[model samples]
Target chain A: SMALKRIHKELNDLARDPPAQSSAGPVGDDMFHWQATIMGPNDSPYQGGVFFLTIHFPTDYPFKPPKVAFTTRIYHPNINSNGSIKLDILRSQWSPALTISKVLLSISSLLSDPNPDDPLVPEIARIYKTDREKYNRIAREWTQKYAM
Target chain B: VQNTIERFTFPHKYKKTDEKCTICLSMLEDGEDVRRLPCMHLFHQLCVDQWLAMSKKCPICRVDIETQL
Candidate 1:
């Protein structure tokens, strides 16, 4: 019941004051499941792409972290081929004070600035570390193919 | 983290102002029972308890709340 109350509050607040370049809501009748969209940052190779994500809230949310994963394919060191993102805030670094809006914003920033040192895809990290130009090119190419 | 939280005792106080608890994004009504973290940030007792049970740091500043223990 508390989780539901918090979820409702978050939904209401989001509708009242929406975040920039992102939108989210329930995926049909299930409030526990949500679909979100984030516009790629203009400064990154992912620019012009519209990335989709899925959010699954636990029964004891705020106390427990949401399961967030990309639905749209992405090419990033932190985001693997399966769309599993390697972000600390979604794991050990999570705080109960965090909100979905903040999480989405963090993901957007991650797209622009990836953590190459701690990567989900080591091959992509290697390329990102050695040849940024090549990395950006491939990222742009992937974005066009999958996220356009 | 739960063990660490249980070891430390937080200072409890009644809300003096209608300030918002950053954790739940809700206002702490006048006279509501609240807990003050070592970092000096205040939150609703229920909200902070849920948070501390999972983490041993102040939600606002991420200050180590375990140091007091």
Candidate 2:
């Protein structure tokens, strides 16, 4: 199948040239399912945190975007309590040209810059919009509490 | 749309061993027939045509190939 072949190729590419601050692989027997880890960006309040994510490639593979979600709780406007990420590339802006490596890099970048204008967590967005210090403080606290 | 894609399809035997099809992330084999998109990106004809069926944009640059028509 195209999906299986492409999945194998992606895994090989990932192993050969792993992206910085992130790593991913099949969880066990199912190549369709994988787990990934991302290190918090240096300049972000969530720095020093380690985040985990789950990825499930559709049977059609790159033609359809993979299902990606945060496994680690994060306090960010674009990420919800349940680990859902509201990113354009994950939805409407998805393209078959995008690789898992690129997706992880984007997520790593997202850690540094949260889009308050289109947020999944309205409450967090409110804080991020109204009080920058409080938002950073709470985010850092969450990092210390759950991401350490 | 199919007609547009067919019109834009440029096929030839790939000669460079170092070039890879970005869609499948696999190196193009010498003498392998590939499709050259209007955006100048190359890929296995089947691989790219499959993608074009869904989206008409170049996978790498996201250029709307239909716009070139």
Candidate 3:
């Protein structure tokens, strides 16, 4: 379909000029299955962690955002304890102009400045907003323990 | 057109009656309208279409079929 063709074009474009903070590509023989790796942001609890993401594009592709999840666990307000993520673009705020590379960059930035104001887990948000030092400690510990 | 019809209508060399619909978990009935999903699962067209319109997944494996088109 035209949408899948567009996704293929976008994937090629992204391959040519990869995002600075991460790398992404089709996982196997399937062009719809994608994988990404992100470098943690400086000064954040996830500073040294290298996070992995799995993106599965539907056949309709550009018309709909891919399903994305964190393969690397992290302690963050937006990311669930089980490594699931709730990104706005993947849900309600998505635009057709957004590409896989752009999403990767957004996730990388999210690691640096987690949006506790709009959190998926309220307890994590409470800790993150009210207890900065403790939240940082726990996040750093999770990064070291889970992300390597 | 005749050749295509013959090819599609020919009986399989081996018939396996054990095949089941992944969504309803019921035995596949003869002459039922079926669709083969990209994930290689077969379902009654009506059953899978309803499932996809709601969740966009293969009922048995949760494979994302929406993107597999």
Candidate 4:
């Protein structure tokens, strides 16, 4: 419970000083359950879109990273069709120094430039790298249809 | 790869103490087959293996000790 309490304090700190391009907070009485909304970066396919995400933290908290899934669907190389993101830092590369706010910012940045080098969906990556314009068009369309 | 049952040396060096197995709730018998969870908790090998097979977690902390591997 001590770790959970610490997580709560960290969450509060994030909510107070939300990142420049995003906002996040608890969804209900269960402080472990949180939600985030991020504004896609300019000059990208998702430029004007606002994407929502949900984070579910285990009771043990920081020792294990929270499970993050996008509430808004979009065509992106690093994200699966099911809205699961394959971000390295959220998985094996996670460090105790990283916080939820930092993760949200990372996710926001991922929208601007997806790392096809380390992809969750290989076909998407192939298309993303070879036919970048086409990929951007599709991403923009998806952003307008879903993320707005 | 060595095929025979290999004893996994403890990753950390520490003075052996009178710590009981959280699962079986029995005193850890020396060289009697025991395993340490990734959370650094110790348990009888069979007990921990059975627990892991059912759910990849530490009985005490419910830490994902098995999944980390």
Q: What is the interface RMSD of each candidate, in Å?
A: 1.4, 1.1, 14.4, 11.8
Residue pairs in clash, model 4:
none
Candidate 1 recovers a fraction of native contacts equal to 0.65
lDDT of residue A42 for candidate 2: 88
DockQ of each: 0.66, 0.73, 0.02, 0.03
Best by lDDT: 2
Question: Where's the lowest-lDDT run of ten residues in candidate 3 chain B?
Answer: B5-14
Model 2 CA deviation exceeding 4 Å by range: none
lDDT of 1 by residue, B1-69 (tens): 554654564646674635887767788877777877777788888889888866677777888885654
Backbone clashes in model 1, listed as residue pairs: none
Ten-residue stretch with the least lDDT total in model 2 chain A: A12-21
Q: Give one digit per residue, the lDDT tens place, for model 2 in A1-148.
A: 7888889998888888867788899989999999999998889998999999999999998889999999999999999888998988898789887989989988888889899998898999999999999999999999998898
Report the TM-score of candidate 3, chain A only: 0.92
Instruction: Quote model 4's iRMS.
Output: 11.8
Report the error of model 3 at residue A134, Å.
Answer: 0.4
lDDT of 2 at B29: 92
Model 2 Cα shift for residue A91 (angstroms): 1.5
Residue B40 miss distance in model 2 (angstroms): 1.2
Q: What is the lDDT of residue A86 in candidate 1?
A: 88
Over A66-133, each residue of candidate 1 has an lDDT whose tens digit, in order, gives: 99999999999998777787888898888878889999999999999999998898999999999999
- Highest DockQ scorer: 2
Q: How close is candidate 1 to the true structure, as a TM-score?
A: 0.92
Number of colliding residue pairs in each model: 0, 0, 3, 0
